[PDB]
């Protein structure tokens, strides 16, 4: 089954791209060495082939959110909001290994390397949760094919198709945000402010003297680091529409219902990093279930989704920690 979810980000989305980048005050990435450069954490981009207005196809970078991040977002929503409430309602306790297996796929970094029995595989792949994600010490194949988050853009037309052209945005959708850190002891201006500090004025003077000496040493040399920092990070602007495509390999109605419940409770979560700055906030606009729209103002609802919700409710009522414990158990 193919699920396409339409997402609009209320707040900017920030997915850090690994690797050191530098930007100048003007806003030029990796500036010439003559000017001053500041560390920059760029938003993750995926190179894609786009047919621009010229008619030729060229590889262009596209700011996206990784499919692994979206998969973990779905898994965390499912666990924290559907599975774990049921387990606690029935007073079901997972072991630490079962917990780590449910939240990260495996309970350690060493796969067993021993095959699973056929009945065990059938039992797990029919499970509402372990069937979708799989993993475990005996690395099982899940049913969930979860994709990245591609913005509806001129550059993503060849990927996501041309049925969302009305939501397409032409120009760059990426913005740079500058961040500062200050030394608190430098903003003291009265003995009252330093009264809460043990030692007080003497401690503040010692701190400032050490800071001055360290700054002079660093200037001359051009090993602790101070609290003064000025850097930037790159974010996707707020208000851009994204397409999320979820495929599931022949699922039972319980698994479809579980995915639908996660989608219903997904907007309460946040897509990527940027917790302090309230990044990653979004709202779901339309959820398409096998080519048909099943999204209402309330959420995923309608007559077509009743069977999935009933099946997942029954599965949750019958769900116990035994399946998780058996899945997470190691043969050796």
């Amino acid at each position: 089954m193919q699920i396409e979810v339409l997402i609009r980000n209320i707040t900017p989305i920030f997915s850090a791209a690994p690797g050191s980048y530098y930007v100048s005050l003007d806003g030029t990435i990796n500036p010439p060495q003559g000017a001053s450069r500041f560390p920059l954490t760029r938003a993750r981009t995926m190179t894609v082939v786009a047919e621009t207005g010229d008619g030729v196809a060229k590889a262009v970078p596209l700011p996206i959110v990784p499919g692994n991040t979206m998969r973990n977002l779905l898994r965390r929503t499912m666990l924290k909001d559907v599975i774990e409430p049921a387990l606690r309602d029935k007073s079901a306790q997972l072991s630490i290994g079962a917990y780590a297996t449910a939240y990260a796929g495996n309970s350690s970094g060493n796969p067993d390397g021993v095959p699973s029995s056929f009945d065990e595989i059938v039992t797990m792949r029919a499970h509402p949760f372990l069937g979708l994600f799989g993993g475990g010490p005996r690395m099982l194949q899940g049913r969930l094919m979860v994709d990245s988050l591609y913005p509806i853009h001129q550059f993503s037309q060849r990927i996501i198709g041309s049925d969302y052209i009305n939501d397409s945005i032409k120009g760059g959708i990426t913005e740079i945000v500058w961040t500062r850190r200050n030394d608190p002891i430098l903003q003291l201006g009265s003995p009252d402010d330093a009264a809460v500090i043990e030692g007080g004025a003497q401690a503040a003077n010692d701190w400032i003297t050490s800071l001055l000496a360290t700054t002079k040493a660093k200037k001359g040399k051009a090993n602790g680091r101070g609290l003064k920092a000025f850097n930037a990070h790159e974010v996707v602007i707020a208000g851009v529409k994204w397409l999320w495509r979820i495929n599931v390999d022949r699922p039972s109605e319980s698994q479809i219902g579980l995915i639908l419940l996660a989608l219903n409770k997904l907007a309460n979560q946040r897509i990527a990093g940027g917790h302090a700055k309230d990044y990653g906030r979004f709202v779901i606009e339309d959820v398409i279930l096998d080519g048909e729209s099943v999204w209402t103002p309330s959420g995923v609802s309608g007559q077509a989704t009743e069977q999935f919700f009933d099946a997942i409710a029954e599965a949750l009522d019958g769900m116990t920690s035994s399946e998780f414990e058996q899945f997470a158990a190691s043969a050796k």
């Binding site: 056929f118 009945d119 059938v122 194949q141």
Partner: protein, 74 residues
Amino acid sequence: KGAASQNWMQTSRINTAEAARHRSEGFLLLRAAKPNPAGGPFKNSLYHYPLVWATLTAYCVGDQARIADLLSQC
């Protein structure tokens, strides 16, 4: 050889998920509880063979027309 030989890797495996599903549904008649990737029907195998870009040249005594006609279908 127009380029160095490349060791090409190929494998062989039967999907254990599909096999287990078929065993459950009765399509496959198997009584064994678990697969054995080391050997048996569900064995994974790893083998390699080399790939080369080459211009094949050989010398022979025979009819040019018929040899060229035979090699046309190759």
